[PDB]
Amino acid sequence: GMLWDYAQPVTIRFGKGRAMEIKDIAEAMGLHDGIMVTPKFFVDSGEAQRLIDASDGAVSTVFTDFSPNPDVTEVDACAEIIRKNHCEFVVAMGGGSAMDVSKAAASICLTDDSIADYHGTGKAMPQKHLPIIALPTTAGTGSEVTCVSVLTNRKLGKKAPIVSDGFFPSVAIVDPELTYSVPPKITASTGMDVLSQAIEGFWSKGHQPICDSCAAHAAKLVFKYLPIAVAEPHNEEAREKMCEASVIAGLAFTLPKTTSSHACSFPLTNIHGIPHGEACGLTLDYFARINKDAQHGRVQEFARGIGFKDVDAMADAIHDLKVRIGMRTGLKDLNLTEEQIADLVRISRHPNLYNNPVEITDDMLDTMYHYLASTD
Amino acid sequence: GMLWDYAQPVTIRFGKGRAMEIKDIAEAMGLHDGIMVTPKFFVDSGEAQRLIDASDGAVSTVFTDFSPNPDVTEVDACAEIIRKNHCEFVVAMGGGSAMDVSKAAASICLTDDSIADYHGTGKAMPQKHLPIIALPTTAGTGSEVTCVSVLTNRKLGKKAPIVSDGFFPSVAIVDPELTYSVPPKITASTGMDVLSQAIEGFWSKGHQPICDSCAAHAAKLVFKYLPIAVAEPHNEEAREKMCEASVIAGLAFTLPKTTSSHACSFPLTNIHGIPHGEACGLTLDYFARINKDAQHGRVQEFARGIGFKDVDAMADAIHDLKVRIGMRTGLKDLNLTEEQIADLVRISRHPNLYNNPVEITDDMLDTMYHYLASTD
Ligand SMILES: [Zn+2]
Ligand SMILES: [Zn+2]
Numbered sequence: 001g002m003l004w005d006y007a008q009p010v011t012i013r014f015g016k017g018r019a020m021e022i023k024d025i026a027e028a029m030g031l032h033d034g035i036m037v038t039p040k041f042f043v044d045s046g047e048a049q050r051l052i053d054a055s056d057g058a059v060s061t062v063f064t065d066f067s068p069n070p071d072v073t074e075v076d077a078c079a080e081i082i083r084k085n086h087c088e089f090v091v092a093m094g095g096g097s098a099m100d101v102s103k104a105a106a107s108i109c110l111t112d113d114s115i116a117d118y119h120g121t122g123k124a125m126p127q128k129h130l131p132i133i134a135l136p137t138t139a140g141t142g143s144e145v146t147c148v149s150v151l152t153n154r155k156l157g158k159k160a161p162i163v164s165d166g167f168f169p170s171v172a173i174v175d176p177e178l179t180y181s182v183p184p185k186i187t188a189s190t191g192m193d194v195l196s197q198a199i200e201g202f203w204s205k206g207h208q209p210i211c212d213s214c215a216a217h218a219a220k221l222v223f224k225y226l227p228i229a230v231a232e233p234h235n236e237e238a239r240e241k242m243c244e245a246s247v248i249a250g251l252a253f254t255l256p257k258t259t260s261s262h263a264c265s266f267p268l269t270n271i272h273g274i275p276h277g278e279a280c281g282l283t284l285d286y287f288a289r290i291n292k293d294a295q296h297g298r299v300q301e302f303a304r305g306i307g308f309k310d311v312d313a314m315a316d317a318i319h320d321l322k323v324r325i326g327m328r329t330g331l332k333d334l335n336l337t338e339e340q341i342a343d344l345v346r347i348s349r350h351p352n353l354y355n356n357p358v359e360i361t362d363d364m365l366d367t368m369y370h371y372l373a374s375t376d
Numbered sequence: 377g378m379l380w381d382y383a384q385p386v387t388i389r390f391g392k393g394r395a396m397e398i399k400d401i402a403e404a405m406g407l408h409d410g411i412m413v414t415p416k417f418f419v420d421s422g423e424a425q426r427l428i429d430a431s432d433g434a435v436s437t438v439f440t441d442f443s444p445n446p447d448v449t450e451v452d453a454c455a456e457i458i459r460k461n462h463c464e465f466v467v468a469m470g471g472g473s474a475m476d477v478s479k480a481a482a483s484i485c486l487t488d489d490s491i492a493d494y495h496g497t498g499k500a501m502p503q504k505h506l507p508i509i510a511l512p513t514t515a516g517t518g519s520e521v522t523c524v525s526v527l528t529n530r531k532l533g534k535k536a537p538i539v540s541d542g543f544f545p546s547v548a549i550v551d552p553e554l555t556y557s558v559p560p561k562i563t564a565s566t567g568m569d570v571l572s573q574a575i576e577g578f579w580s581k582g583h584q585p586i587c588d589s590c591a592a593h594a595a596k597l598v599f600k601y602l603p604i605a606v607a608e609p610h611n612e613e614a615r616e617k618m619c620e621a622s623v624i625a626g627l628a629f630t631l632p633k634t635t636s637s638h639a640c641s642f643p644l645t646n647i648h649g650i651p652h653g654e655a656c657g658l659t660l661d662y663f664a665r666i667n668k669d670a671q672h673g674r675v676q677e678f679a680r681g682i683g684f685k686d687v688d689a690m691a692d693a694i695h696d697l698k699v700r701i702g703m704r705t706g707l708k709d710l711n712l713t714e715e716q717i718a719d720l721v722r723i724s725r726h727p728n729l730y731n732n733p734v735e736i737t738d739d740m741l742d743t744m745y746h747y748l749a750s751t752d
């Protein structure tokens with residue numbers, strides 16, 4: 001007998017060109033003077049102004065002063081801009097960073113505190129917030145359907161997530177046109193993020209059947225369309241299918257949580273500069289073979305459902321995909337020392353590691369990292 | 377270019393025994409003095425009082441005075457009980473009827489109007505409502521995750537649905553134990569409702585990928601577990617799997633809407649007394665063979681995905697399933713006249729018929745109903 005809780009409060013508006021529907025949402029909610037939180041890139045490309053003009057006054061303010069890893073100071077500056085301009089809703093347009101700034105700011109602007117007071121301090125967030133409209137511009141982190149904001153405190157050397165039900169966007173507009181300009185290398189890494197979220201969401205010990213269905217759907221799309229999107233950045237079908245996979249994989253992993261590849265990805269990114277998606281993909285087929293017979297055949301059933309003979313064939317396809325799109329298959333070029341490998345082993349023991357269906361021991365991590373350290 | 381809107385506002389608590397969590401939900405919402413809307417069967421069996429006593433005073437009122445086809449007068453009576461008792465939330469425990477009554481009563485109780493003023497009159501419902509906790513006792517109509525209430529006005533001779541965003545339950549508790557007492561003939565019919573909802577939701581012109589994923593998951597479960605649930609009413613695994621299929625098929629059909637089998641089911645139930653799920657099942661394999669090659673092979677991919685060689689093998693299995701569980705394969709025993717057959721043809725032209733991926737003409741309906749009229 002299974003027990004699970006399923007809650008997915010975000011409304012998804014999917015479709016090419018639908019980023020122009022910000023006005024519709026604001027009008028339906030009776031809100032004015034929105035603030036758009038977006039990286040400077042979309043100001044320079046005229047995308048921001050295009051969407052601002054389309055809002056016919058619904059959005060009045062733009063905030064771009066945040067970093068790819070957002071800081072609590074940038075959230076606090078964003079919240080003060082909200083107060084000064086009396087903003088009633090937040091349009092988060094960008095990758096994970098813009099969305100995580102927006103979730104935090106939309107809550108804290110209603111108070112006179114700093115976001116740091118709730119950053120890892122164990123203190124629960126206030127729950128009243130400005131409505132958030134999230135417009136992902138990559139495919140993707142899936143952040144547009146999560147209630148998590150990952151921030152850093154640079155002055156305090158701390159990086160922790162903040163979880164609050166008030167962080168769920170009200171509407172996610174998933175518009176594939178906003179991804180057409182993502183460069184091939186970033187398309188590849190963000191695509192591997194989707195595939196990792198889907199596969200790990202399915203085989204997590206916290207698996208539940210609705211997320212299972214989303215995971216299989218998204219994974220199948222990535223194998224077919226990710227090579228097309230990397231090789232043909234203006235192939236509209238492949239971009240649309242990657243955006244479909246991205247948002248649905250977001251629905252797949254949010255509740256079951258991720259597992260071994262995500263646990264290992266954090267030191268690969270933070271210490272060695274490997275982008276998140278590529279870092280997840282580095283271990284994805286390795287752990288797939290470890291997990292092949294887990295849960296009385298569930299993963300084999302998954303592999304067959306998305307079109308492979310078995311898990312080993314899916315693992316081969318993961319490797320082949322990585323090679324085709326230029327994602328790391330090894331770490332030999334890092335010339336890792338034994339001390340560095342021991343650091344990877346130690347820091348990879350993250351709570352997510354325990355969601356893997358097979359126990360991943362320290363000796364297994366040591367074996368994996370020595371394997372990667374001697375593989376191109 | 378795919379366009380779709382996805383919204384699923386219901387929180388689902390799935391699990392054997394979790395109907396005891398009513399008080400935990402009322403606590404979290406800060407609500408008291410709930411009313412339980414449930415058929416007399418559950419009062420007589422002791423199950424209602426078992427759950428009310430478990431709620432530690434959360435539920436103070438019981439309402440059973442409604443019909444298997446609920447009337448506007450019974451909704452109004454429920455709303456008056458709510459007002460008299462200052463009830464703050466509604467617990468709908470039963471099949472489609474109890475959930476239909478509960479949704480409409482929870483909105484209309486905040487007005488001094490009859491629900492009849494909003495029943496097929498073009499007048500939209502007021503949107504404020506008491507929160508609804510839905511506890512389905514069959515697997516199922518899926519009503520615990522829809523915003524639709526189907527009511528009849530016996531004095532006016534009208535049977536029509538009311539659609540309102542305020543009708544969405546706040547929480548759906550899907551506790552398979554509540555289905556253990558469903559007799560085999562009703563288990564069979566409600567199970568065919570699940571299968572039709574899943575298959576029609578998938579091939580509907582309004583199809584969208586999250587609903588597609590849910591549909592395939594639910595349909596696969598029905599083929600395996602519905603014969604077991606019918607043959608073994610206290611097989612806990614089969615009852616749990618049918619509940620999983622039921623709530624997930626509810627997610628599959630709510631947004632894309634149902635199609636030809638549901639359109640035809642309405643006169644089959646309203647004129648000839650055939651229960652809803654059985655009435656949908658009567659035409660499901662028939663329309664499958666008409667629809668098999670629509671949408672450039674989508675339905676064939678669906679059939680293969682859930683394990684059939686093709687749609688015709690799936691339709692064969694739908695037929696074999698109906699025979700095994702005692703569901704109607706024909707209408708010969710009704711000795712239908714040519715006028716009655718024409719009535720079926722005419723009345724089956726419901727708005728949902730145009731959701732079918734292949735145009736269903738009057739000639740095609742005439743052929744189908746003459747076939748059914750000549751088949752055991
Ligand atoms: Zn990730
Ligand atoms: Zn139905």
